[PDB]
Design an enzyme around this catalytic site. Structure first.
Site, PDB file in Angstrom:
ATOM      1  N   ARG A   1     110.982  24.168 104.956  1.00 36.90           N
ATOM      2  CA  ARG A   1     111.375  25.116 105.998  1.00 36.90           C
ATOM      3  C   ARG A   1     112.643  24.729 106.760  1.00 36.90           C
ATOM      4  NH1 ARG A   1     109.003  29.217 103.700  1.00 36.90           N
ATOM      5  NH2 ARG A   1     106.716  29.277 103.859  1.00 36.90           N
TER       6      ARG A   1
HETATM    7  N1  LIG Z   1     101.030  31.916 110.437  1.00 36.79           N
HETATM    8  C1  LIG Z   1     101.823  31.556 109.433  1.00 36.79           C
HETATM    9  N2  LIG Z   1     102.508  32.515 108.701  1.00 36.79           N
HETATM   10  C2  LIG Z   1     103.137  32.143 107.521  1.00 36.79           C
HETATM   11  N3  LIG Z   1     103.090  30.825 107.077  1.00 36.79           N
HETATM   12  C3  LIG Z   1     102.420  29.887 107.797  1.00 36.79           C
HETATM   13  C4  LIG Z   1     101.780  30.241 108.980  1.00 36.79           C
HETATM   14  N4  LIG Z   1     101.193  29.138 109.489  1.00 36.79           N
HETATM   15  C5  LIG Z   1     101.445  28.097 108.668  1.00 36.79           C
HETATM   16  N5  LIG Z   1     102.206  28.541 107.614  1.00 36.79           N
HETATM   17  C6  LIG Z   1     102.683  27.697 106.503  1.00 36.79           C
HETATM   18  O1  LIG Z   1     102.132  26.395 106.635  1.00 36.79           O
HETATM   19  C7  LIG Z   1     103.152  25.425 106.793  1.00 36.79           C
HETATM   20  C8  LIG Z   1     102.706  24.300 107.716  1.00 36.79           C
HETATM   21  O2  LIG Z   1     102.668  24.713 109.064  1.00 36.79           O
HETATM   22  P1  LIG Z   1     102.254  23.664 110.220  1.00 36.79           P
HETATM   23  O3  LIG Z   1     101.760  24.385 111.423  1.00 36.79           O
HETATM   24  O4  LIG Z   1     103.450  22.759 110.575  1.00 36.79           O
HETATM   25  O5  LIG Z   1     101.044  22.840 109.536  1.00 36.79           O
HETATM   26  P2  LIG Z   1     100.036  21.980 110.438  1.00 36.79           P
HETATM   27  O6  LIG Z   1      98.639  22.615 110.476  1.00 36.79           O
HETATM   28  O7  LIG Z   1      99.948  20.608 109.883  1.00 36.79           O
HETATM   29  O8  LIG Z   1     100.577  21.916 111.873  1.00 36.79           O
HETATM   30  C9  LIG Z   1     104.376  26.195 107.269  1.00 36.79           C
HETATM   31  O9  LIG Z   1     105.573  25.556 106.872  1.00 36.79           O
HETATM   32  C10 LIG Z   1     104.189  27.528 106.581  1.00 36.79           C
HETATM   33  O10 LIG Z   1     104.684  27.440 105.263  1.00 36.79           O
END
Ligand SMILES: Nc1ncnc2c1ncn2[C@@H]1O[C@H](COP(=O)(O)OP(=O)(O)O)[C@@H](O)[C@H]1O
Ligand SMILES: Nc1ncnc2c1ncn2[C@@H]1O[C@H](COP(=O)(O)OP(=O)(O)O)[C@@H](O)[C@H]1O
Ligand SMILES: [Mg+2]
Ligand SMILES: [Mg+2]
Lengths: 255, 318, 122, 128, 317, 128, 317
Positions: free
Chosen positions: F118
């Site tokens: 990303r």
């Molecule tokens: N609501 C969303 N809409 C589209 N993609 C999402 C969404 N939430 C998470 N993702 C996908 O999941 C990945 C990880 O998100 P992140 O929140 O950083 O994970 P974590 O649960 O470890 O915090 C993002 O880069 C995206 O590709």
């Protein structure tokens, strides 16, 4: 003592599992570092050293022999547990007995497809080796198709025969407790199933037949058996007598 | 936990200890105090204990769940001591009931660390098997006299491979194995017909008829067991005529194995039945032959002899 | 999921994969022998197909014409439905065999670390 | 106090799963070697002591009673678990609830097959 | 066991000594005494050991099962040392067999446990990877020669991911899988031609021709395996002229992969062949073109070069 | 050095899985209480402190950067195990490789459906 | 790992904090430093942080993946104390966003080891839950004022029975459990509809229209769940006319339980959506009732209100 002085012995360890448990008791109470399943790191060294004392001696050292039949109790079919894993790795072969086999009828409950002898062939008499080889291949082929036995009415010609041969030999492998057979008595009965004489006889009647058939050959054909043993295999003469004894008996059975 | 051990030891006392000509010993080892008071007053009513005269036939020993481990680790030894004298210095027929013998192992393992031992597998004390050994080997028929011993064995976490129950098997001539999977279906007693064994299950001893019907029942139940998971996905109709007939019979045999107990009346709503041996063998012989394949399976559920199942089917006309 | 739960599930699904593989063959023998017999008749659990005609519903010359268009359609679709059921079961074997090994490993480690805790604390 | 004075009391322990965790902590810090699943060897005795104190008294002791409803939290709906089976093995039965039944509409989410009463009809009116 | 493992070992020794003038060492890591004796006498028989003179091409280092974990954890090291003299002093290409590698790990695990060390994942020793590394890193190409090792792999609970196999696969440059189904179907050596892979199987290492030919063989045998479902139950008299070509070509290739060994001479009767790399490549390349399309199937079974496939197709007039 | 003195560097850790096992060896010889797969509580910290040092500095600090491509070897696609889920939850994205795709002849064997990056989207050329 | 905790918490900050009258605290616990730099600069650009004024709305406390364990073990207390002041000594309303609170517990294991305790299960500190308690009970609304806390909770190896997450449930009023399996189906936010609970889900608090629809959706989603074993093998083709219907509806509901986020616009390219509560009820009321049985599944995927799904069916040529 027997192995060393020209004689032959057979030892049964019943069972090694409880010996291990016992050694663990001492090991732990002496504060020796516990390991997998609480066993000390030299529980293998305990069994391995025992079971390698069984040996076949050459002519120079007397010619004797010691044969080991150790027994291991698994827990819910876990052959992979520490001690099972150990003794399996030490021995020259394994006889696997199974619960669902036991209650399905298969008694003794030996899993023929999983059990092994690495020594194998090189310790059967020529007569047994002949019928045993045919039975091995006929049962193995059976095991592949066994699943589609109870779920197949539109079976082709070649497999319908395989199923029938299979269940027949399977029944021939069944045996009562406290009644061991002479090796010739054995080949004689396997002979019947292997050559396809029991193919038309109903699978639920094979036990009754084998008992009557064996009783008969022991009563009247004491010479036919003596030939199977001594001739060192099934001869042309022996092949002929068997073909007659069975057919006539089989007709007499089903009447 | 909670599959029928006690109810079963209670029914056996009802069926065997009441008739028995001789003495009995009940040991309450690490179980419910309530149960002990229940037992005490049931035996007073029935006369097996008499407070007035001296025609008493049971001795009671109790070291229940409310006691520290040391009391629980020893009460089983107290019970069998009362049972030992009656065996030798009276030489008579002795019954011995122990509920529950697991609580002598558990107890021993409750104090093991405070005793300075490294734990063996699954938490247990390294002396599990020998503690058992020197204890169980005392519960036995000798040449001086006889002890019939019934022992309830708790199976922790519903795992028969657990060191404690697993090491108990070798000390037994007959095993009755209850099962939750069977209890939750409403089959009482929840005995597993494919895991309960006995040393005298031999044609040379119980006769060939007893043995052939017995193995016949297990054979069909194992067959139905190995179809269970397959028919659930592929549908019932895809089965051959031989199979969907063993499915009907095995399911009916499954229910005819269930039986109302004189002791479980407060649970079943059913008058207890006790089925004599020859009526059991012939009854099951009949279901296997095919003589009841026109009856609905719910006719065989919670009844006594085979005659009562026909009566139940008749009542289910309306 | 424990080992008992998985090995039970494994053996049964390995069986469903077997019966379905043979029912793929049985349907293939019935399909070919029926597509070879639609040729002269041309000019004169099988999936959705048993519902397709039963949902669309809600002498001797034509009665035959449909009865050989049926067996080609049915023993064909059963070959397709079962070709899936066995391949789905195969994928479920490969997946569950993997879960079983992870779980086996984990359990061994766990049960060992519990023994270690008890020895060190003394 | 109610039980021994001819009165009737009901106690709820919500939940004995957490008390065991507290006990586990207390034990391990007192340097008492861990037993099964890291709990002390005597986690059964912990709850057995307590629930055996729920009792019905005869009339010479005042006819009082204490009734107990201990609460235990399962992990992933597994009643066959070591701690759950320990408590189940103490009480006179269990009401067992399942999230699957809960979400299907079966509320209360009582699993009938797995829930039992060890006093049975004796605790019911004739009408019930 | 069952499939021709020992024979293959005895052939490798014999073939490597004849072609590359290098000796062999065999290390029995927790070997059963019965199977140890059996190998000794079997090795005398095949001529790789000579009791009478000094033409024996193998050395034997044995650490039997009934010995303490220390002994059995060191036997791979005793054998590695012997093998090293032949590389670092006589400048040879040494062939080292370890039978088997799991028991090396097994032994280390026990020593560790006995030393009071805390076990790792799955009960193995925490030094698992280094125990492996310190041993496995001496088996290399120096500038003065090389030691090449063939190690027997046992897989616990048939689990490849298990720490014992999993670790070993880091040091492996090739797998040779002796198949069960291929042994009973007559084919010897019983090497599965689709489970067996190589790291040095890359055009930049062994030439473009070697790569392209063997990838063609792999493709034809892989396409054959998928066609078998259409063949077995439906029927052979369905497929077009382009599919019949691939069926018979691949079946002839299967037969050409079998070989008469020099060690199996006093057992099967047939003379043993040692085929050079050039003759191996050209033969299979020739079958892929369609040069031997006319020849009968049963010619390539148990022959040396593609020339022996001519003499055998003539003898069956 | 390159990060802080205005330059740009790229580090490749091949692989971080084996560093974890070395550190597990260290931790178990030291007698540190093992957790999942016998790893010590601080395996996450082991990789986190390291992988954090890869950064993009602003012009005020020289405008340099360090880029980290750590390698993790999974067993049989188990991108759910301890060490894989650690490194995933530390780095900015993943390039996923499957045995499946390699065999078929998708080389390089990237799953272009699971893979993410990303923060690399802003740093992509307009041409691309 | 990688399911959408942070994306969820960032969308929540955008959707609740901007439109409430009061202060907010953000605590970064054991997380990514870059994320901190990301949050800081984006708050500066929007104007909730003002480096020149005194109108700043957010206090930042950070102790990330680069800090020693002790530091990460206490950061949660620091951000908590900042939030404690704003709640009490102003008579006001505070929002508290912690990401990630698991790292507090995790940091406790690290120091617990060196403090030389006997560990509990899974290696964790024996004080796990009292630690958590004395910490969690300070994050609470009082009579003096309220804290709305939204804490992100990491789940070791997806095991919600792992002591860390297992103990955290007791401390919450609402749980939003994210599901890996749901994300792999491409559903976002990957909220598990059958594993997420709230204490306010009561027909006396939210009204019966809200309660009956919610429960009805959980029913159809539960019934579909038990139908997924039979499908997994045989397929939807072996289903009844009754079961086929619940499946189509449950799949339409599963997808309508997904919506694009504003904080997701950066990579999705699709405008983010905000659905008023009454529209969520009306939307799901309708799918259940059977009002959209002709429409296809993919029409309910990644939309806001139910109107938008209708328009998406027209768009599909
Ligand atoms: N609501 C969303 N809409 C589209 N993609 C999402 C969404 N939430 C998470 N993702 C996908 O999941 C990945 C990880 O998100 P992140 O929140 O950083 O994970 P974590 O649960 O470890 O915090 C993002 O880069 C995206 O590709
Ligand atoms: N024989 C049976 N018939 C009817 N109900 C039974 C029977 N056995 C057990 N139950 C029911 O199940 C409960 C558990 O039985 P119990 O003997 O107390 O279990 P255990 O002693 O093995 O822990 C009983 O309270 C009773 O309600
Ligand atoms: Mg009881
Ligand atoms: Mg995050």
């Amino acid at each position: 003592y027997f192995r060393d002085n020209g004689k032959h012995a057979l030892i049964i360890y019943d069972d090694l599992s409880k010996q291990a448990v016992a050694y663990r008791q001492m090991s732990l109470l002496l504060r020796r570092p516990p390991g997998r399943e609480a066993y000390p790191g030299d529980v293998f060294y305990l069994h391995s050293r025992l079971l390698e004392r069984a040996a076949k001696m050459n002519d120079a050292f007397g010619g004797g022999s010691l044969t080991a039949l150790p027994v291991i109790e698994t827990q819910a079919g876990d052959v992979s547990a520490y001690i099972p894993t150990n003794v399996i790795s030490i021995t020259d072969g394994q006889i696997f007995l199974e619960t669902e086999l036991f209650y399905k009828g298969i008694r003794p409950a030996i899993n023929v497809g999983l059990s092994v002898s690495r020594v194998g062939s090189a310790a059967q008499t020529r007569a047994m080796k002949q019928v045993a080889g045919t039975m091995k291949l006929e049962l193995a082929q059976y095991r592949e198709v066994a699943a589609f036995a109870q779920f197949g009415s539109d079976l082709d010609a070649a497999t319908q025969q395989l199923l029938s041969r299979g269940v027949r030999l399977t029944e021939l492998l069944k045996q009562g407790q406290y009644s061991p057979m002479a090796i010739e008595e054995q080949v004689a009965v396997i002979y019947a199933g292997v050559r396809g004489y029991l193919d038309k006889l109903e699978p639920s009647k094979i036990t009754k037949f084998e008992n009557a058939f064996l009783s008969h050959v022991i009563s009247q054909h004491q010479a036919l058996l003596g030939k199977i043993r001594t001739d060192g295999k099934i001869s042309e003469e022996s092949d002929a007598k068997l073909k007659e004894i069975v057919t006539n008996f089989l007709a007499g059975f089903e009447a | 936990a909670g599959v029928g051990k006690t109810v079963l030891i209670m029914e056996l006392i009802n069926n065997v200890a009441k008739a028995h000509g001789g003495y009995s010993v009940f040991a309450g080892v690490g179980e419910r105090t309530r149960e002990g008071n229940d037992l005490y007053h049931e035996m007073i009513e029935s006369g097996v204990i008499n407070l007035k005269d001296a025609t008493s036939k049971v001795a009671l020993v109790y070291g229940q769940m409310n006691e520290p481990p040391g009391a629980r680790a020893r009460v089983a030894l107290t019970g069998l001591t009362v049972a030992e004298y009656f065996r030798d210095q009276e030489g008579q027929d002795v019954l011995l009931f122990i509920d529950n013998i697991f609580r002598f192992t558990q107890a021993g393992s409750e104090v093991s660390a405070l005793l300075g031992r490294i734990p063996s597998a699954v938490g247990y004390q390294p002396t599990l098997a020998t503690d058992m050994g020197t204890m169980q080997e005392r519960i036995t028929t000798t040449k001086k006299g006889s002890i019939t011993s019934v022992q309830a064995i708790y199976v922790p976490a519903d795992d028969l491979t657990d060191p404690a129950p697993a090491t108990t098997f070798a000390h037994l001539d007959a095993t009755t194995v209850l099962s939750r999977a069977i209890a939750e279906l409403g089959i009482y007693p929840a005995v597993d017909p494919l895991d309960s064994t006995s040393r005298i299950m031999d044609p040379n001893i119980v006769g060939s008829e007893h043995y052939d019907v017995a193995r016949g029942v297990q054979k069909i139940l194992q067959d139905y067991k190995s179809l269970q998971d397959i028919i659930a996905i592929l549908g019932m109709d895809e089965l051959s005529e031989e199979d969907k007939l063993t499915v009907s019979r095995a399911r009916k045999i499954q229910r005819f194995l269930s039986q109302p107990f004189q002791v479980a009346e407060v649970f079943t709503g059913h008058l207890g039945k006790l089925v004599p041996l020859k009526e059991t063998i012939k009854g099951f012989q009949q279901i296997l032959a095919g003589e009841y394949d026109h009856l609905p399976e719910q006719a065989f559920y919670m009844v006594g002899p085979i005659e009562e199942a026909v009566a139940k089917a008749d009542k289910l006309a309306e | 999921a424990t080992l008992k739960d998985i090995t039970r599930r494994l053996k049964s699904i390995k069986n469903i994969q077997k019966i379905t593989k043979s029912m793929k063959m049985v349907a293939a023998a019935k399909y070919a022998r029926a597509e070879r017999e639609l040729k002269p008749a041309r000019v004169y659990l099988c999936g959705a197909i048993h519902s397709s005609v039963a949902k669309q519903m809600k002498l001797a010359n034509i009665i035959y014409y449909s009865l050989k268009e049926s067996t080609t359609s049915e023993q064909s679709a059963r070959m397709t439905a079962m070709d899936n059921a066995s391949k789905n079961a195969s994928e479920m074997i490969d997946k569950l065999t993997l879960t079983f090994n992870r779980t086996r490993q984990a359990v061994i480690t766990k049960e060992l670390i519990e023994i270690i805790s008890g020895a060190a604390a003394l």
